[PDB]
């Protein structure tokens, strides 16, 4: 139903460098009732389970570093990292947490 599109798919980065990822949704994820956008970002290292980075499109999970900033509204969202670190090389997924069925984007893999 709700299609999640992320770009770019692959991204060669260097430590200290800044990176911006984009995730566009099929339909709006903004709940006019609380003005909150039901979009969440994930991080996934190989052979590891998905990790919650940000929910409500901009609220950081208890634990994640500030260098992880999420923003956007309704249909367009983006993930940002000021001066990417080494342990920041995983795959990032955005997920529609608004309505059923839950859908994830294909993700963006940060490369060396």
């Amino acid at each position: 139903d709700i299609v999640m599109t992320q770009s770019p798919s692959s991204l060669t980065v260097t430590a200290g460098e800044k990176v911006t990822m984009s995730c566009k949704s099929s339909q709006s994820l903004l709940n006019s009732g609380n003005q909150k956008n039901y979009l969440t970002w994930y991080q996934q290292k190989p052979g590891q389970p998905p990790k919650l980075l940000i929910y409500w499109a901009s609220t950081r999970e208890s634990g994640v570093p500030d260098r992880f900033t999420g923003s956007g509204s309704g249909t367009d969202f983006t993930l940002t990292i000021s001066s990417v670190q080494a342990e920041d090389l995983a795959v990032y997924y955005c997920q529609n947490d608004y309505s059923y069925p839950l859908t994830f984007g294909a993700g963006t893999k940060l490369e060396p």
């Binding site: 909150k36 389970p49 997924y93 997920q95 947490d97 994830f104 294909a106 993700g107």
Partner: protein, 120 residues
């Protein structure tokens, strides 16, 4: 802390069925929603469905509903993912996650380690 313990890897022949378990530690599933996500070598994740251990109500994805069955045993704090008639396309990693329903809002924070299922 809280933890979602998952069963070991599986290797089944095409046509056979399979049961996966997701035991919860540090909380009673009777207060959380147990979801199941599938991930093929590809990378993209796919929601399969959820269940309410309290009421026993389920919710599958249209493409999975006719293949997956999510069962729950409160007496053992365990949730199950029953997969029928396997095919190559079923070869993937299956994670189990939880969501606290008794609360304004709470994302899919904790996840199981994921149990790999290879058919071919």
């Amino acid at each position: 802390e809280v933890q979602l313990q998952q069963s070991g890897a599986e290797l089944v022949r095409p046509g056979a069925s399979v049961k996966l378990s997701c035991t919860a530690s540090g909380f009673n599933i009777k207060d959380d929603f147990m979801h199941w996500v599938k991930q093929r070598p590809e990378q993209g994740l796919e929601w399969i469905g959820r269940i309410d251990p309290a009421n026993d109500n389920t919710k599958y994805a249209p493409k999975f509903q006719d293949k997956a069955t999510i069962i729950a045993d409160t007496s053992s704090n365990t949730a199950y993912l029953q997969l029928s008639s396997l095919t190559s396309e079923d070869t993937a990693v299956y994670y189990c996650a939880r969501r606290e329903v008794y609360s304004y809002y709470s994302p899919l924070d904790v996840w199981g380690a994921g149990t790999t299922v290879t058919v071919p």
